[PDB]
Design a protein around this ligand. Structure first.
Ligand SMILES: O=c1nc[nH]c2c(CNCc3ccccc3)nccc12
Ligand code: NI
Ligand SMILES: [Zn+2]
Length: 330
């Protein structure tokens, strides 16, 4: 069995290897990459997402989100307070202001320390979940707006045509901007490209141990857990690496830098934070291997984790017994 310790693996595809997306995902899994829940892909030196990022300042962040924390330094939840609209230009200036800027630090390790020590005492503002793409239409390899659709993957595997579209999202980040512990909708894969700016630090639990994370979460957020059997789908719970280590939870960490892709694999729980002003682009995708995961994915039916009309079909075809209840929650 490849990668039995579930280490995060880093790949350096050649330009020829970067042509066929599906084939390279499959190659990665042949080397056991999926066991980690997350892989880093460094593009060939010949490749670029687009020519420059000089002209992105007029992009609108219609609903910037202030991430307000509650709890203790290593075990907290965050809620999203909507803020007034701003452009990327305005957001970048805000991120660089004294109130929000990255503090002086020696290295990524020092900064991670500072993050977990102090995150809860601030409320950074995240330009999250903006429909759009920064890939040039002429970029033919690993263009997140031109991947096979999940709806076509389902159709090809299972024979049924369904409604729905899958498009990418942009994330404009600043220091302490946080993504909570989660797997993707329907335990899909995701791909994340860091277009510009400061790093993004990731934590990931191997898919084979996801239930260990879930158990700890029910213990650490007892009220949330009573409220919903799949509350991690709300995407509000943070648990620090120190707490995971204290509780014997298997996990790994890595820092993503501008120009690098991260792929998360089905049922790979992940969380993390931004080091400073940055922009990432992300989308979900599927492969034939995902279908079994999709069939078994736990659903939030409590009303909190409202999602896109896109998931309807996935639940309806893959999880017919759960569909009615899940629908009531939507
Ligand atoms: O860095 C991040 N900032 C916000 N959400 C993140 C998430 C949430 N899931 C990924 C996703 C986003 C959009 C569409 C489909 C899937 N995963 C990984 C990193 C981040
Ligand atoms: Ni994600
Ligand atoms: Zn719920």
């Amino acid at each position: 069995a490849q990668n039995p310790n579930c280490n995060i693996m880093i790949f350096h595809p050649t330009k020829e290897e970067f042509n066929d997306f599906d084939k390279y995902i499959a190659y990665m899994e042949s080397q056991g990459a999926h066991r980690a829940g997350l892989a880093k892909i460094i593009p060939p030196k010949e490749w670029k997402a687009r020519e420059t990022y000089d002209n992105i300042s007029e992009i609108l962040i219609a609903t910037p989100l202030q991430q307000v924390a509650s709890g203790r330094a290593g075990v907290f939840t965050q809620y999203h307070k909507k803020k007034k609209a701003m452009t990327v230009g305005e957001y970048r200036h805000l991120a660089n202001s004294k109130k929000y800027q990255t503090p002086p630090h020696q290295n990524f390790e020092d900064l991670e320390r500072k993050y977990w020590k102090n995150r809860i005492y601030n409320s950074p503002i995240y330009g999250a979940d903006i429909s759009g793409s920064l890939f040039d239409e002429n970029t033919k390899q690993w263009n997140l707006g031109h991947l096979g659709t999940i709806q076509d993957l389902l159709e090809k595997e299972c024979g049924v045509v369904i409604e729905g579209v899958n498009t990418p999202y942009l994330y404009f980040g600043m220091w302490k901007t946080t993504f909570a512990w989660h797997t993707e909708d329907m335990d899909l894969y995701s791909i994340n490209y860091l277009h510009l700016g400061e790093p993004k630090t990731w934590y990931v639990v191997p898919p084979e141990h996801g239930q260990r994370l879930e158990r700890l979460a029910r213990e650490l957020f007892p009220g949330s857990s009573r409220g919903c059997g799949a509350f991690l789908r709300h995407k509000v719970a943070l648990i620090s690496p120190t707490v995971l280590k204290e509780n014997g939870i298997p996990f790994n960490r890595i820092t993503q830098e501008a120009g690098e892709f991260m792929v998360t694999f089905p049922y790979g729980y992940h969380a993390g934070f931004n080091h400073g002003f940055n922009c990432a682009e992300a989308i979900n995708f599927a492969t034939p291997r995902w279908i079994d995961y999709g069939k078994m994915a736990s659903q939030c039916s409590c009303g909190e984790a409202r999602v896109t009309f896109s998931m309807d079909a996935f639940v309806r075809i893959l999880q017919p017994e759960r569909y009615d209840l899940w629908k009531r929650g939507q």
